[PDB]
Design a protein around this ligand. Structure first.
Ligand SMILES: Nc1ncnc2c1ncn2[C@@H]1O[C@H](COP(=O)(O)OP(=O)(O)OP(=O)(O)O)[C@@H](O)[C@H]1O
Lengths: 434, 412
C-alpha cells in the first residue's frame, strides 16, 4: 500500500459549486477565506490566459499554507504541471542562483502530446533484408495469439543488429519510438544446446500488435535541458560518454527564444497543446535579495507560469540585505507584485476536526475521550505536535494489545515526547549545562 | 480395471440384403491396418442402419493349412504402413467379408464395390489389388477412394466442391491433405509415418520398462483399451506435463488400471499407475521425437504445407480444418489443434476446426453416401472390361480419390 504523509489527506479545496467554502470537505477544514481565495487561483490557472501572475500564502507556522498549495495541486490534478521547490533549492554550486529560478519557472509550463503507442512483440520467425544494399527489412513475429510481418526501416534493422537479434529471439518493437529490446530466446529453442549462456522466455501469451492512445506530459525545462548540451546520443553502447561528466549549466536566454519559437510552430499544428502550470516557491523568505530581484523580471514576462509563494516570517531581515527588515521576509518591491492570501490560527474545535481527519487517514481508531485530550493538548502547544502524537499513541495501544487510542495512551505519549515550547523551558532552566 | 475384448460374433446373412430400385446395389468396403469394415450401400435409407462387420484387420491359419481364422478370433495382417501389400492373406480377408455379407450364386462377387485405399497408393499396390479384385473376385465395376476424404464427404453440408485440410490419423500413418475445390492437392500434401499402432506400441514399451515384474500381464490388446478410454492429448504438452510434476495433481489424476487378480498383491497384480503415460502416447503424432523419429509431426507439417500457398488462398482451406481417423478419438484433440493453429495463423485471421461426427466410422459412412450418390455414374468407376485396356494401376479421379498419373506397369 501507499505511505501516509504530512498532507496525504488533502484531496482538494473542498469548495462548493458557487465557489464558497464548505466548513469541512475534501480533507480540509476551517480556513474558509484562504480556501475561497485559492478557488479563484484554481480558476485563474484553469483559464490559461495569464502569465507570471503570482500569489503569496502568508501566515503563522502550522496554519495550512502548504496544505492549501497542495490543495490547488489536487484541484488541477496530474493534467497541469505543479512544480514544488523550497526557496532553499536556489543555492546551487553548479549554476547561478538566478538560473535555478528560471529552470524552475520553465518546469511549470507543460506540453501535452498525444501519440498512438504502437507495440509489436513476439518470437522473430525471420529477418530478411531486401536499393541493392537494404531498401527495407521484412521481419516476421509470432505469439500464442498469432503472427505478423513488419516492413522495418534500415535504422530499426541496425537496432535489431545492435541488440544481437537472430531468428527465434523474442523481441519487443515499438513502432513510434523505434525502441527495440531483445527479451530472450524463444523457449521452443531452449533445447538447441543443453547449456548455452542465454535466457529462454516462453512465447508471449499476448497479442502480436498492441495499441494505446497515450497522452505524454513534458515541460519546457525538459526541452531546454535536452537541447542545450550535446546529447549522450548512444544507448550506453559507447565510451566517449565516460570522459565528460554532466553538469547543470547556465542555458542561454537565446536558446529559450528558439525553444519558444519551435513550440509555437508545433502547437499551431495541433501536434502539442500547452498547459500553463504552477510553480510553488515554498518558503520564499529563504530566497536572497538577488533572487527576489530577478523575480521582478520573471513575474512580468509574457511566458511565465503562475507562481505561488509561501511565507511565515514576521517583520524580519531580507536574506542577503544584511540590514533591511521587510514583511514576510520579502522585499516591498516584490510584495507589491503578488496577491496576498492571509492564513489564520484555528479555534480548538477546528484543530480537533484535523486531529480526527489525521487519525482516520493515518489508520488510527480513536475514542472521543482521547480526541478531546489531543484537542486540548493542541491549545497547550501547536497543531502539528498533537497530530504527531497519533501514530505513537496508536503504537503503544497496539503493543498494549488494544484496537484504539484511549486517554492513557495519549497521556503517556505526552509525558514521553516533548513539544517545541515545553522543551524550550528545559533549555532555559538548565542554561549552564548545554 | 481393464475389460477384455470381444471375439467370434454371428453376423451371418442370406445370399445378400440386396435393396429395391435399380438392379446394382454396391458393397462399401473400408480397408485400414487397424480394422476392416464393410456393408451393402443400403440405397434409399437415410441413416445407414448398420456399418456391418466391425473387425480387427488381423488373421491366422493352421500350420497344416486346414482352417483360416480371418475374422475377430499369434496372427498377421496384409498391410504395411496402412497400404495393402499382400495376396495370400488379402484373399482370406476379403473372403471372410464377402461370406458374411452374402454371395449371390455364381463364380464372382455379385455387384459393384467402393474399396477404400491409401492417400497416395503405390501404382504396384493398386495393380496388385485390382488384379486380385478382377481375377479372383470379378467385381463388375470398382471405385477406389480415400478414408479421410470419404469422412469429409459425409461431414460436408452438401454435394458441393469444398476446400480444407483433412487432418487424418489412421493406424500406421497420419496425413495432412490440403484440398482445393474438391481436388486433393497431392503435389504438396504430406504425411507423418506414425499413428495409433506406434503410440500403442510406445505405451506398451513404457509399461514393460516400468513393470519388469510382470512383462507378460500387460499386452498390446490391453494397451488399445487405455489408449482409447483413458489417454488424452494435452492442450499444450510442456504445460500439461508441468502440472503433472506436483504430487497433489498427480494423485488426483493417476489411474488405477488394475490387472485381473488371482504383500498388498500389487507386485503381481498391480493397479498399473498411468500418469504422464496417459499423455505421452497421444503426443506421438504431434511430437514424434518422443519415439526418437526426426519427422516434423502434425503441427510443423501443417505449417510447412500451408505456408507454400498464396496468402489469399490459405484462408479458405484453414476455414475447414477437418480432424478424422482413429487417433482423433482422443478427448481434447480439437482443443489442442485450434491452439496449435492459433499459434501460426495471422494475428486477427479466422480459422475453423471441425471434428468428424464419428472420428472413425465416417470413413465408411462417407464411402456409403458416396456410393449411393454415384451408383449410376459411368465415368466415376473402373468398369470390369477397362482392366483389359488399362493395366490396373488406373484411377478415375472422382472427388474423394487421388490424382491419376498417365502411366503403365511392365510385368511378366
Ligand atoms: N484544513 C486544514 N487547514 C489548515 N491546515 C491543515 C489542514 N489540513 C491539513 N493541514 C495541516 O497543515 C500542516 C502542515 O502544513 P502547513 O501549511 O500548516 O505548514 P506551515 O507551517 O503553515 O507552512 P510551511 O509549509 O511553510 O511550513 C499539517 O499539520 C496538516 O495537518
Amino acid at each position: 500500500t501507499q505511505r501516509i504523509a504530512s498532507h496525504s489527506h488533502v484531496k482538494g479545496l473542498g469548495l462548493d459549486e458557487s465557489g464558497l467554502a464548505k466548513q469541512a470537505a475534501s480533507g480540509l477544514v476551517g480556513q474558509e477565506n484562504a480556501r475561497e481565495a485559492c478557488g479563484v487561483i484554481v480558476e485563474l490557472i484553469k483559464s490559461k490566459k495569464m502569465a507570471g501572475r503570482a500569489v503569496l500564502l502568508a501566515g503563522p507556522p502550522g496554519t495550512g499554507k502548504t496544505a492549501l498549495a497542495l490543495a490547488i495541486a489536487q484541484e488541477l490534478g496530474s493534467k497541469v504541471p505543479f512544480c514544488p521547490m523550497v526557496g532553499s533549492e536556489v543555492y546551487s554550486t553548479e549554476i547561478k542562483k538566478t538560473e535555478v529560478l528560471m529552470e524552475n519557472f520553465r518546469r511549470a509550463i507543460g506540453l501535452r502530446i498525444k501519440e498512438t503507442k504502437e507495440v509489436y512483440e513476439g518470437e522473430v520467425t525471420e529477418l530478411t533484408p531486401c536499393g541493392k544494399t537494404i531498401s527495407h527489412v521484412i521481419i516476421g513475429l509470432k505469439t500464442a495469439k498469432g503472427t505478423k510481418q513488419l516492413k522495418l526501416d534500415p535504422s530499426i534493422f541496425e537496432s535489431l543488429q545492435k541488440e544481437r537479434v537472430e531468428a527465434g529471439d523474442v523481441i519487443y518493437i515499438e513502432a513510434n519510438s523505434g525502441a527495440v529490446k531483445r527479451q530472450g530466446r524463444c523457449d521452443t529453442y531452449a533445447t538447441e544446446f543443453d547449456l548455452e549462456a542465454e535466457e529462454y522466455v516462453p512465447l508471449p501469451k499476448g497479442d502480436v500488435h498492441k495499441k494505446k492512445e497515450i497522452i505524454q506530459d513534458v515541460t519546457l525545462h525538459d526541452l531546454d535541458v535536452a537541447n542545450a548540451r550535446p546529447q549522450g546520443g548512444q544507448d550506453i553502447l559507447s565510451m566517449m560518454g565516460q570522459l565528460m561528466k554532466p553538469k547543470k549549466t547556465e542555458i542561454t536566454d537565446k536558446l529559450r527564444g528558439e525553444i519558444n519559437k519551435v513550440v509555437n510552430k508545433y502547437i499551431d499544428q495541433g501536434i502539442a497543446e500547452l498547459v500553463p502550470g504552477v510553480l510553488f516557491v515554498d518558503e520564499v523568505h529563504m530566497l536572497d535579495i538577488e533572487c527576489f530581484t530577478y523575480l521582478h523580471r520573471a513575474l512580468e514576462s509574457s511566458i511565465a507560469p503562475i507562481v505561488i509563494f509561501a511565507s511565515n516570517r514576521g517583520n524580519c531581515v531580507i536574506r542577503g540585505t544584511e540590514d533591511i527588515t521587510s514583511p514576510h521576509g520579502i522585499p516591498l518591491d516584490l510584495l507589491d507584485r503578488v496577491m496576498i492570501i492571509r492564513t489564520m490560527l484555528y479555534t480548538p474545535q477546528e484543530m480537533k476536526q484535523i486531529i480526527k481527519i489525521r487519525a482516520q487517514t493515518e489508520g488510527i481508531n480513536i475514542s472521543e475521550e482521547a480526541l478531546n485530550h489531543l484537542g486540548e493538548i493542541g491549545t497547550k502547544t501547536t497543531l502539528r505536535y498533537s497530530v504527531q502524537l497519533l501514530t505513537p499513541a496508536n503504537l503503544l495501544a497496539k503493543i498494549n494489545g488494544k484496537d484504539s487510542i484511549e486517554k492513557e495512551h495519549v497521556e503517556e505519549i505526552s509525558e514521553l515526547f516533548y513539544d517545541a515550547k515545553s522543551s524550550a523551558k528545559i533549555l532555559a532552566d538548565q542554561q549552564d549545562k548545554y | 480395471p481393464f475389460r477384455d475384448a470381444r471375439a467370434a460374433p454371428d453376423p451371418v446373412l442370406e445370399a445378400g440384403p440386396v435393396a429395391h430400385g435399380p438392379l446394382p446395389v454396391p458393397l462399401v468396403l473400408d480397408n485400414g491396418s487397424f480394422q476392416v469394415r464393410a456393408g451393402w450401400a443400403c440405397p434409399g435409407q437415410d441413416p445407414g442402419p448398420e456399418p456391418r462387420l466391425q473387425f480387427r484387420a488381423v488373421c491366422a491359419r493352421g500350420r497344416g493349412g486346414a482352417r483360416g481364422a480371418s475374422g475377430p478370433q499369434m496372427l498377421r495382417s496384409p498391410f504395411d504402413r496402412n497400404v495393402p501389400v499382400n495376396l495370400e492373406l488379402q484373399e482370406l480377408l476379403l473372403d471372410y467379408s464377402f461370406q458374411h455379407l452374402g454371395v449371390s450364386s455364381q463364380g464372382c462377387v455379385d455387384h459393384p464395390i467402393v474399396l477404400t485405399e491409401a492417400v497416395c497408393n503405390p501404382l504396384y499396390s493398386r495393380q496388385m489389388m485390382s488384379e486380385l479384385l478382377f481375377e479372383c473376385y470379378g467385381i463388375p465395376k470398382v471405385a477406389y477412394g480415400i478414408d479421410s476424404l470419404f469422412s469429409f464427404y459425409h461431414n460436408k453440408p452438401k454435394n458441393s466442391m469444398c476446400s480444407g485440410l483433412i487432418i487424418s490419423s489412421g493406424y500406421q500413418c497420419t496425413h495432412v491433405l490440403p484440398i482445393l475445390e474438391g481436388r486433393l492437392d497431392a503435389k504438396n500434401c504430406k504425411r507423418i509415418n506414425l499413428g495409433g499402432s506406434q503410440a500403442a506400441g510406445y505405451l506398451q514399451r513404457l509399461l514393460q520398462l516400468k513393470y519388469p515384474g510382470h512383462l507378460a500381464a500387460i499386452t498390446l490388446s490391453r494397451m488399445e483399451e487405455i489408449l482409447h478410454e483413458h489417454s488424452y492429448i494435452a492442450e499444450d504438452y510442456v504445460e500439461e506435463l508441468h502440472k503433472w510434476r506436483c504430487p497433489d495433481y498427480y494423485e488426483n489424476n493417476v489411474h488405477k488400471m488394475q490387472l485381473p487378480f488371482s504383500v498388498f498383491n500389487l507386485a503381481a497384480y498391480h493397479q498399473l499407475f498411468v500418469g504422464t503415460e496417459r499423455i505421452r502416447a497421444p503426443e506421438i503424432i504431434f511430437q514424434p521425437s518422443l519415439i526418437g523419429e526426426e519427422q516434423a509431426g502434425i503441427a510443423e507439417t501443417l505449417q510447412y504445407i500451408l505456408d507454400r500457398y498464396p496468402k489469399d488462398i490459405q484462408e479458405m482451406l484453414v476455414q475447414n480444418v477437418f480432424l478424422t481417423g482413429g487417433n482423433t478419438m482422443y478427448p481434447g484433440m480439437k482443443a489442442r489443434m485450434e491452439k496449435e493453429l492459433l499459434e501460426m495463423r495471422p494475428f486477427r485471421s479466422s480459422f475453423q476446426v471441425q471434428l468428424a461426427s464419428n472420428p472413425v466410422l465416417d470413413a465408411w459412412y462417407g464411402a456409403r453416401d458416396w456410393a449411393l450418390n454415384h451408383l449410376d455414374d459411368n465415368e466415376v468407376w473402373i468398369t470390369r472390361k477397362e482392366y483389359e485396356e488399362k493395366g490396373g494401376e488406373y484411377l478415375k479421379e472422382h472427388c474423394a480419390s487421388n490424382i491419376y498419373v498417365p502411366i503403365r506397369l511392365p510385368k511378366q
